[PDB]
A paper describes a structure:
The ATPase CpaF in C. crescentus is the only Tad motor reported to date that is known to be bifunctional, facilitating both pilus extension and retraction at the flagellar pole through ATP hydrolysis.
The presence of ADP, despite supplementing the sample with excess ATP, suggests purified CpaF harbors in vitro enzymatic activity. Since CpaF assumes three main conformations in a nucleotide-dependent manner, we believe the closed, compact, and expanded states captured in the apo, under-saturating, and saturating datasets, respectively, best represent the catalytic cycle. Given the expanded state harbors two ADP-bound monomers in the asymmetric unit, we further classify Exp-ADP into Exp-ADP1 and Exp-ADP2. In summary, the coupling of ATP binding and hydrolysis expands the hexamer and rotates the C2 axis clockwise by 60°. The predicted C3-symmetric CpaGH heterotrimer fits snugly into the hexamer pore of the CpaF expanded state, suggesting that in this ATPase conformation, the platform complex could facilitate entry of three pilin subunits from the inner membrane into the central platform shaft through the openings between CpaGH heterodimers, gated by the N-terminal α1 of CpaH.
Residue numbers in the entry:
A (entry chain D), B (entry chain C): 80 to 501
C (entry chain B): 252 to 501
Write the structure that this text describes.
């Protein structure tokens, strides 16, 4: 259509007609209004039979390309979308109703896509380029974006976006999805109420954050919880909750406040619980402190595929913190601090389930001893292809945290659930 | 030679007529359009007897030396040659028909060759010199260039070009070469379509990558595929494929993006199948994770002579990377993740055979149990062939992956091929 | 010349030729001055001329006869501690030059690991020189070097890798009277636990000294009918020579 040619011609000229440094210092509406005059002037020269609505659409497209996120803006806005995949300048896919399908949109050039990705990542403050070719981030709106640079992606820089979900799941939803048997839900309720230190371990996309949210839903409302995340993904209904959020290095690369700083400050604002949005770095150390140095009941979420692996990664993180503690000391601290290690994993069929509810019970010489209260045994593959399994207790009638249950009167509930779940 | 002598005489005058640095000052991508006239106009400026037929060849050679890649040009241009290899200004070998062969072509001097290689690599943007004698790059043409500088290669500058084979063997070709019997071909087809996890073991140059490509040929077009190759070798026809390639560490030991660093990201961009060009280290772990963390149907390739060798080697690779997982856990992960292992070997006769198609069923005593389905049996040795060509199905009705085959509706072909294998 | 100096019996020479042609991952071992470099050069003289061989030598010593050899030499940290192209980097690059055999001049440290990978990952027929007094001591040194590489490799993993990659070890020693002899031709046979089991196809046995003080000894075979690498010989049709040599040794 003549509209596309007119837009291309106007763009090829307005670049040298409007100074970028002037619009760069204005909000989206201000920049669009300023560029409206430039678009009108361009239309005046070599004018075409374009309607006012066509001019407005062209101005919106110019704003999206120069300042927005290019041909994605029409799609990103749409709510029907679940995921957006690009994997090349000339191809873009969308997930609708659980089915991926091609789209009619595309970028002018893979360099346009590259700079669009750079803009999107910069919105979080990270950098993607030939020296830093891979960038994963979670946007403030909550959607996740992963981009990879040409030096690795032979087909040009590749981009993927997964849009933030409006509604979170609750323990009832997990029970109905069979991610955890109802007795497992009861035991989780006991563990959450009884202020047992929690490390929800899992793998990528394995539902860790959802478990953390559902568990924190069990906290006594009176307690002063201090959420601490890299992004605003936790929603707590408790009345007294303080939500923090780290800030990464920006521009020159200063003003950053890492998770460790936030936790170390949390220690000095008398929080009943600390709920770390995710543990990746030395903060684990400062988190493990205040799991036992008061603030009992703090929770964290961690990326590991097995409770043994989770403990190993905690030890590795603490060691990398530079505190130079002996490995024996680190193991002792872990044993003394961590009480429960829930593990959420995704199975072959794609469903997500809580494979282990492990409980750290002691340190034997060199190895931490872990006794599992709930374990998920996979029977096999159903007729329909969906993996099928059953949760079962280990028969423990008095887990380590039993004492804490006695503190809150939940001893009977725990005893009932433990034996009834087998 | 008369032609070479005349060309050298003409070039001696041309270099003065058009300064050597003059072309560099001009746009090298289009400066040749000028020098071509200089040689064309008043051809034989030295008044050297020649003919138009030979004059055209002389002018083309002069242009190639001045602008092109000199004597290397036909080699690159010709399609018959897969690999070019230069050990110095004197000796240059090519690869054709699967065999190496010396060639009559040679360069005038080491400085000429060094300039040629510097130009060829710089076209990608990298630089090779005494400061950085080593150099590795991938050209836009789909080729890999490795260059070593004289300060290291005592014989002189060393160069190796590995071109991307345009035509990969189709499955019909493999059937024709008796590599796999038609029943084996159908079993492979069902396995590929049935979204079974593959590990294509093979011997040195036993055709692993070609087998992997012909296997990918079976993927449903709608499924997202994220190809992660050490070196671009695969060629997929699916509409929705994504190609990734690692980067070796710079000579300073920086900028490296190892395989695991790629597959870990592959986990995060919603793939349907992850395909690893060659699993050769701790990256295997991550792949196996993605093998069972959903994404079922991923296919990686490994170097080994027997399926048992391949699986033991995979355990070894997993235990690297400092992950420190128990061997029992590694075996459990492997049995739960991998489904089918295919072993292909190059026989003494010079041909290649898909020697094994086997299935993993479990440990049954901490020793992974491999149940072969298709075996290549050598009834004996031909006096001059030493090859028989017998592919036999072990029977074994209802292989472990039978249920998935039924789910996808390929049960008919699986039964028809596994049975009536001969 | 080596046969003339009785350093190896003709049967030993034939077995060595079999190993060289049969693409067995060799590791020449021997004390300093044992001529191990000379032995390595002679062994390379047996490689098939078509095969492409890349020579990564810390200092130029080898002189191959084949027509398709690429010679490489390391660099010291000339640039004030920088610019050091260590042997390990050279081998890592050689892995990307599609060579048939990688002939390391001498293995002194981390470069061993990658070399082993070369043997395990396609480049069969690779060779190398190691400074050692006994084949077992040589294997221990190789494991130690791999560990020194800094890779977080459990000792069991390194032992298994050595088992699966190496195929032959040749021991060359300078004897008391200043002569050179080849003492052992062993073949790593597997990891049967926490220790690497080893076979010995060819051995040298001393008996005493002559009237002039010269040590007296002779070579013999262990009678192993089929060495581990026997299958490789089948690949290149070297069964007959291997059997004949291992049988005629005694
Ligand atoms: N048990 C479950 N059943 C069904 N859907 C689930 C279940 N658990 C999680 N989900 C869905 O899967 C996604 C879970 O993502 P979640 O935020 O938990 O990931 P994460 O572990 O925080 O991720 P990452 O490790 O990549 O940062 C959401 O879409 C959630 O709706
Ligand atoms: N089954 C086969 N029969 C005949 N030739 C084959 C077969 N498989 C591979 N080849 C040839 O061997 C060459 C190497 O194959 P490829 O798999 O790319 O390397 P590698 O064997 O090292 O993985 C290819 O160019 C191909 O033509
Ligand atoms: N079998 C042998 N008999 C006699 N002299 C030998 C023998 N092997 C090596 N030499 C002599 O030893 C010298 C150095 O040996 P060399 O290969 O440098 O050992 P290394 O590599 O351990 O230093 C050579 O110059 C050679 O003349
Ligand atoms: Mg999360
Ligand atoms: Mg290959
Ligand atoms: Mg020496």
């Amino acid at each position: 259509d003549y509209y596309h040619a007119t837009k291309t011609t106007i763009f090829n000229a307005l670049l040298n007609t409007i100074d970028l440094s002037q619009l760069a210092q204005l909000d989206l509406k201000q920049a669009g209004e300023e560029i409206r005059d430039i678009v009108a002037e361009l239309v005046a020269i070599k004018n075409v039979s374009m309607s006012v609505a066509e001019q407005e659409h062209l101005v919106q497209d110019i704003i999206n390309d120069v300042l927005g996120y290019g041909p994605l803006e029409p799609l990103l806005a749409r709510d029907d979308i679940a995921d957006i995949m690009v994997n090349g300048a000339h191809r873009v896919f969308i997930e609708v109703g659980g089915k991926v399908q091609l789209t009619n949109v595309r970028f002018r050039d893979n360099l346009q896509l590259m700079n669009i990705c750079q803009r999107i990542v910069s919105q979080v403050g990270r950098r993607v380029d030939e020296s830093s070719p891979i960038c994963d981030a979670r946007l403030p709106d909550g959607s996740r974006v992963n981009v990879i640079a040409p030096p690795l992606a032979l087909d040009g820089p590749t981009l993927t976006i997964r849009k933030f979900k409006k509604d979170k799941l609750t323990m009832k939803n997990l029970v109905e999805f069979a991610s955890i048997s109802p007795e497992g839900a009861r035991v989780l309720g006991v563990i959450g109420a009884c202020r047992c230190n929690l490390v929800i371990s899992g793998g990528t996309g394995s539902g860790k954050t959802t478990l953390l949210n559902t568990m924190t839903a069990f906290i006594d409302p009176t307690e002063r919880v201090v959420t601490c995340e890299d992004a605003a993904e936790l929603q707590l209904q408790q009345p007294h909750v303080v939500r923090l959020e780290t800030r990464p290095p920006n521009l020159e690369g200063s003003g950053a406040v890492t998770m460790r700083d936030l936790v170390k400050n949390c220690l000095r604002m008398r929080p009943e619980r600390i709920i770390v949005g995710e543990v990746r770095g030395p903060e684990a150390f400062d988190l493990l402190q205040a799991m036992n140095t008061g603030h009992d009941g703090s929770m964290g979420t961690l990326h590991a595929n097995s409770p043994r692996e989770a403990i190993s990664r905690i030890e590795s993180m603490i060691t990398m913190g530079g505190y130079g503690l002996p490995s024996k000391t680190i193991k002792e601290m872990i044993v003394g601090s961590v009480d429960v290690i829930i593990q959420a994993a995704r199975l072959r069929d794609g469903s997500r389930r809580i494979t282990h509810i492990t409980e750290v019970v002691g340190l034997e010489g060199d190895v931490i001893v872990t006794q599992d209260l709930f374990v998920y045994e996979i029977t096999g593959e159903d007729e329909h292809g969906k993996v099928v399994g059953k949760h079962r207790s280990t028969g423990i009638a008095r887990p380590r945290f039993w004492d804490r249950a006695r503190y809150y009167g939940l001893e009977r509930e725990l005893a009932e659930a433990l034996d009834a779940a087998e």
